[PDB]
C-alpha atoms as an extended CHARMM CRD file, in Angstrom:
* protein
*
       124  EXT
         1         1  UNK       CA              4.3360000000       12.7710000000       21.7700000000  PROA      1               0.0000000000
         2         2  UNK       CA              3.0950000000        9.3160000000       20.6710000000  PROA      2               0.0000000000
         3         3  UNK       CA              3.5260000000        9.1250000000       16.9790000000  PROA      3               0.0000000000
         4         4  UNK       CA              0.6000000000        7.7430000000       14.6710000000  PROA      4               0.0000000000
         5         5  UNK       CA              1.6990000000        5.4640000000       12.2160000000  PROA      5               0.0000000000
         6         6  UNK       CA             -0.3310000000        6.8000000000        9.9420000000  PROA      6               0.0000000000
         7         7  UNK       CA             -0.9420000000        9.8770000000        8.0560000000  PROA      7               0.0000000000
         8         8  UNK       CA             -3.2800000000       12.5900000000        9.9300000000  PROA      8               0.0000000000
         9         9  UNK       CA             -6.4640000000       13.8880000000        8.4270000000  PROA      9               0.0000000000
        10        10  UNK       CA             -6.4760000000       17.6650000000        8.1430000000  PROA      10              0.0000000000
        11        11  UNK       CA            -10.3940000000       19.3490000000        8.6910000000  PROA      11              0.0000000000
        12        12  UNK       CA            -11.2900000000       22.1420000000        6.6660000000  PROA      12              0.0000000000
        13        13  UNK       CA            -11.0940000000       25.0190000000        9.0950000000  PROA      13              0.0000000000
        14        14  UNK       CA            -15.0820000000       25.5450000000       11.0300000000  PROA      14              0.0000000000
        15        15  UNK       CA            -15.9440000000       21.8870000000       10.5400000000  PROA      15              0.0000000000
        16        16  UNK       CA            -16.6290000000       19.6460000000       13.6240000000  PROA      16              0.0000000000
        17        17  UNK       CA            -14.6840000000       15.9160000000       13.0220000000  PROA      17              0.0000000000
        18        18  UNK       CA            -17.3670000000       14.3390000000       14.9900000000  PROA      18              0.0000000000
        19        19  UNK       CA            -20.2240000000       15.3550000000       13.0610000000  PROA      19              0.0000000000
        20        20  UNK       CA            -18.5690000000       14.2040000000        9.5010000000  PROA      20              0.0000000000
        21        21  UNK       CA            -16.3230000000       11.0890000000       10.8990000000  PROA      21              0.0000000000
        22        22  UNK       CA            -17.9090000000        7.4840000000        9.2370000000  PROA      22              0.0000000000
        23        23  UNK       CA            -17.4560000000        5.4370000000       12.6170000000  PROA      23              0.0000000000
        24        24  UNK       CA            -15.7080000000        2.5590000000       10.9360000000  PROA      24              0.0000000000
        25        25  UNK       CA            -13.2770000000        5.0650000000        9.2130000000  PROA      25              0.0000000000
        26        26  UNK       CA             -9.9640000000        2.8360000000       10.1180000000  PROA      26              0.0000000000
        27        27  UNK       CA             -7.0140000000        2.9950000000        8.1260000000  PROA      27              0.0000000000
        28        28  UNK       CA             -5.7310000000       -0.0130000000        6.2690000000  PROA      28              0.0000000000
        29        29  UNK       CA             -2.4300000000       -1.4990000000        6.4500000000  PROA      29              0.0000000000
        30        30  UNK       CA             -1.3780000000       -2.5860000000       10.2020000000  PROA      30              0.0000000000
        31        31  UNK       CA             -2.9390000000       -5.4110000000       11.8130000000  PROA      31              0.0000000000
        32        32  UNK       CA             -5.8050000000       -8.2920000000       11.8030000000  PROA      32              0.0000000000
        33        33  UNK       CA             -9.4710000000       -7.8910000000       11.6030000000  PROA      33              0.0000000000
        34        34  UNK       CA             -9.5360000000       -8.2280000000       15.2620000000  PROA      34              0.0000000000
        35        35  UNK       CA             -7.4860000000       -4.6980000000       15.4690000000  PROA      35              0.0000000000
        36        36  UNK       CA             -9.3090000000       -2.4660000000       13.2360000000  PROA      36              0.0000000000
        37        37  UNK       CA            -10.4400000000       -0.2910000000       16.1990000000  PROA      37              0.0000000000
        38        38  UNK       CA             -9.1590000000        2.7800000000       17.5850000000  PROA      38              0.0000000000
        39        39  UNK       CA             -9.3360000000        6.5070000000       18.2800000000  PROA      39              0.0000000000
        40        40  UNK       CA             -8.8910000000        9.9780000000       15.9880000000  PROA      40              0.0000000000
        41        41  UNK       CA             -7.2230000000       12.4320000000       18.0190000000  PROA      41              0.0000000000
        42        42  UNK       CA             -7.0660000000       16.0490000000       17.9450000000  PROA      42              0.0000000000
        43        43  UNK       CA             -3.3730000000       17.7370000000       17.8210000000  PROA      43              0.0000000000
        44        44  UNK       CA             -3.8210000000       21.5350000000       18.4060000000  PROA      44              0.0000000000
        45        45  UNK       CA             -1.5110000000       23.4820000000       16.1310000000  PROA      45              0.0000000000
        46        46  UNK       CA             -1.1930000000       27.5690000000       16.2990000000  PROA      46              0.0000000000
        47        47  UNK       CA              0.8030000000       30.4520000000       14.0870000000  PROA      47              0.0000000000
        48        48  UNK       CA              0.2590000000       33.8480000000       13.5500000000  PROA      48              0.0000000000
        49        49  UNK       CA             -2.5900000000       34.2820000000       11.1410000000  PROA      49              0.0000000000
        50        50  UNK       CA             -3.6930000000       37.8320000000        9.9070000000  PROA      50              0.0000000000
        51        51  UNK       CA             -1.4360000000       39.7920000000       13.0480000000  PROA      51              0.0000000000
        52        52  UNK       CA             -3.1550000000       37.3360000000       15.5870000000  PROA      52              0.0000000000
        53        53  UNK       CA             -2.7170000000       33.5130000000       17.4310000000  PROA      53              0.0000000000
        54        54  UNK       CA             -4.9930000000       31.4070000000       15.0140000000  PROA      54              0.0000000000
        55        55  UNK       CA             -5.4480000000       27.9010000000       15.8580000000  PROA      55              0.0000000000
        56        56  UNK       CA             -4.4310000000       26.1900000000       12.1090000000  PROA      56              0.0000000000
        57        57  UNK       CA             -6.8560000000       23.4700000000       10.2810000000  PROA      57              0.0000000000
        58        58  UNK       CA             -7.0660000000       20.3330000000       12.8870000000  PROA      58              0.0000000000
        59        59  UNK       CA             -5.0710000000       17.3200000000       12.0920000000  PROA      59              0.0000000000
        60        60  UNK       CA             -6.6570000000       14.0140000000       13.6580000000  PROA      60              0.0000000000
        61        61  UNK       CA             -4.3040000000       11.3920000000       14.3630000000  PROA      61              0.0000000000
        62        62  UNK       CA             -4.9270000000        7.5430000000       14.2380000000  PROA      62              0.0000000000
        63        63  UNK       CA             -4.2980000000        5.6020000000       17.5540000000  PROA      63              0.0000000000
        64        64  UNK       CA             -5.1300000000        1.8550000000       17.6150000000  PROA      64              0.0000000000
        65        65  UNK       CA             -7.3800000000        0.8560000000       20.9190000000  PROA      65              0.0000000000
        66        66  UNK       CA             -5.0620000000        0.4150000000       24.2170000000  PROA      66              0.0000000000
        67        67  UNK       CA             -2.1400000000        2.5260000000       22.4510000000  PROA      67              0.0000000000
        68        68  UNK       CA             -1.1080000000        6.4960000000       22.0700000000  PROA      68              0.0000000000
        69        69  UNK       CA             -1.7770000000        9.3700000000       23.8250000000  PROA      69              0.0000000000
        70        70  UNK       CA             -4.9470000000        8.0760000000       25.5380000000  PROA      70              0.0000000000
        71        71  UNK       CA             -3.9070000000        4.2330000000       25.5450000000  PROA      71              0.0000000000
        72        72  UNK       CA             -5.2280000000        3.7050000000       28.9950000000  PROA      72              0.0000000000
        73        73  UNK       CA             -8.6480000000        4.7450000000       27.6070000000  PROA      73              0.0000000000
        74        74  UNK       CA            -12.0240000000        2.0780000000       27.0230000000  PROA      74              0.0000000000
        75        75  UNK       CA            -13.2510000000        2.2500000000       23.8060000000  PROA      75              0.0000000000
        76        76  UNK       CA            -16.1810000000        5.2100000000       23.3930000000  PROA      76              0.0000000000
        77        77  UNK       CA            -15.0260000000        6.4120000000       26.5500000000  PROA      77              0.0000000000
        78        78  UNK       CA            -15.8130000000       10.1260000000       26.0090000000  PROA      78              0.0000000000
        79        79  UNK       CA            -12.7780000000       12.2820000000       25.5660000000  PROA      79              0.0000000000
        80        80  UNK       CA            -12.8400000000       16.0020000000       23.7230000000  PROA      80              0.0000000000
        81        81  UNK       CA            -10.3680000000       15.3750000000       20.8580000000  PROA      81              0.0000000000
        82        82  UNK       CA            -11.1590000000       11.8240000000       20.3710000000  PROA      82              0.0000000000
        83        83  UNK       CA            -13.0870000000        9.8430000000       18.1640000000  PROA      83              0.0000000000
        84        84  UNK       CA            -13.8360000000        6.0220000000       18.2810000000  PROA      84              0.0000000000
        85        85  UNK       CA            -13.6860000000        4.1110000000       15.3090000000  PROA      85              0.0000000000
        86        86  UNK       CA            -13.8730000000        0.1580000000       14.5300000000  PROA      86              0.0000000000
        87        87  UNK       CA            -14.5990000000       -2.1280000000       11.7390000000  PROA      87              0.0000000000
        88        88  UNK       CA            -17.9310000000       -4.0900000000       12.3190000000  PROA      88              0.0000000000
        89        89  UNK       CA            -16.0880000000       -7.5720000000       13.6640000000  PROA      89              0.0000000000
        90        90  UNK       CA            -13.1030000000       -5.9780000000       15.5720000000  PROA      90              0.0000000000
        91        91  UNK       CA            -12.4900000000       -6.9800000000       19.0920000000  PROA      91              0.0000000000
        92        92  UNK       CA            -12.6010000000       -4.7990000000       21.9140000000  PROA      92              0.0000000000
        93        93  UNK       CA             -9.3330000000       -5.6650000000       23.5350000000  PROA      93              0.0000000000
        94        94  UNK       CA             -6.4250000000       -3.2020000000       23.7630000000  PROA      94              0.0000000000
        95        95  UNK       CA             -4.1300000000       -3.4650000000       20.8560000000  PROA      95              0.0000000000
        96        96  UNK       CA              0.2870000000       -4.4040000000       21.1430000000  PROA      96              0.0000000000
        97        97  UNK       CA              1.2260000000       -3.3030000000       18.1920000000  PROA      97              0.0000000000
        98        98  UNK       CA              2.3990000000        0.2010000000       19.9570000000  PROA      98              0.0000000000
        99        99  UNK       CA              2.9060000000        3.5480000000       17.9910000000  PROA      99              0.0000000000
       100       100  UNK       CA              5.4750000000        4.5460000000       15.4620000000  PROA      100             0.0000000000
       101       101  UNK       CA              8.9670000000        4.6160000000       16.1350000000  PROA      101             0.0000000000
       102       102  UNK       CA             10.8320000000        8.5580000000       15.6430000000  PROA      102             0.0000000000
       103       103  UNK       CA             13.0240000000        7.5990000000       13.1850000000  PROA      103             0.0000000000
       104       104  UNK       CA             10.1030000000        5.7140000000       10.9150000000  PROA      104             0.0000000000
       105       105  UNK       CA              7.7420000000        6.7320000000        7.9820000000  PROA      105             0.0000000000
       106       106  UNK       CA              4.4800000000        7.3300000000        8.3970000000  PROA      106             0.0000000000
       107       107  UNK       CA              2.3660000000        5.5360000000        6.2820000000  PROA      107             0.0000000000
       108       108  UNK       CA             -0.5520000000        7.1490000000        3.6850000000  PROA      108             0.0000000000
       109       109  UNK       CA             -3.7390000000        6.8810000000        4.7370000000  PROA      109             0.0000000000
       110       110  UNK       CA             -6.2070000000        4.3960000000        2.4530000000  PROA      110             0.0000000000
       111       111  UNK       CA             -9.9800000000        3.6160000000        3.9360000000  PROA      111             0.0000000000
       112       112  UNK       CA            -12.3050000000        1.2630000000        2.8650000000  PROA      112             0.0000000000
       113       113  UNK       CA            -15.1070000000        3.8970000000        2.9260000000  PROA      113             0.0000000000
       114       114  UNK       CA            -15.6290000000        7.5810000000        1.6500000000  PROA      114             0.0000000000
       115       115  UNK       CA            -14.0880000000       10.2230000000        2.9140000000  PROA      115             0.0000000000
       116       116  UNK       CA            -16.2180000000       13.6260000000        3.2460000000  PROA      116             0.0000000000
       117       117  UNK       CA            -14.5260000000       16.8090000000        1.3940000000  PROA      117             0.0000000000
       118       118  UNK       CA            -14.0270000000       18.6840000000        4.5720000000  PROA      118             0.0000000000
       119       119  UNK       CA            -11.4620000000       15.5850000000        5.6850000000  PROA      119             0.0000000000
       120       120  UNK       CA             -7.9270000000       16.7250000000        3.7440000000  PROA      120             0.0000000000
       121       121  UNK       CA             -5.2860000000       13.9490000000        2.9730000000  PROA      121             0.0000000000
       122       122  UNK       CA             -2.1130000000       16.0600000000        3.2680000000  PROA      122             0.0000000000
       123       123  UNK       CA              1.2080000000       13.9900000000        2.4420000000  PROA      123             0.0000000000
       124       124  UNK       CA              4.8340000000       14.3450000000        2.4630000000  PROA      124             0.0000000000
């Protein structure tokens, strides 16, 4: 249910997010140096493709530490569909910024680092 402040990454079908994601891939635009820490969360979708149920390309959504679908998790807790990220110098402290409201626009993804070609940034 909880909405990310940012657009998701769409992962090229067949790739594995946790093999390719930089450990400091934290979207830019919200918070201070201490708060640049959180997780990407996989959110699965199915449709009919070639006349059968198919999982769509995975979309991964960023949430600050202490927010989102896994708001109670601690940094580096092993959870299927969660990949932990932090900028160097971030504080391992739960964040009070919450999540995006249902009537507010998502922000486009911008990063300090490069991303692999398997990480697609679809916009609306």
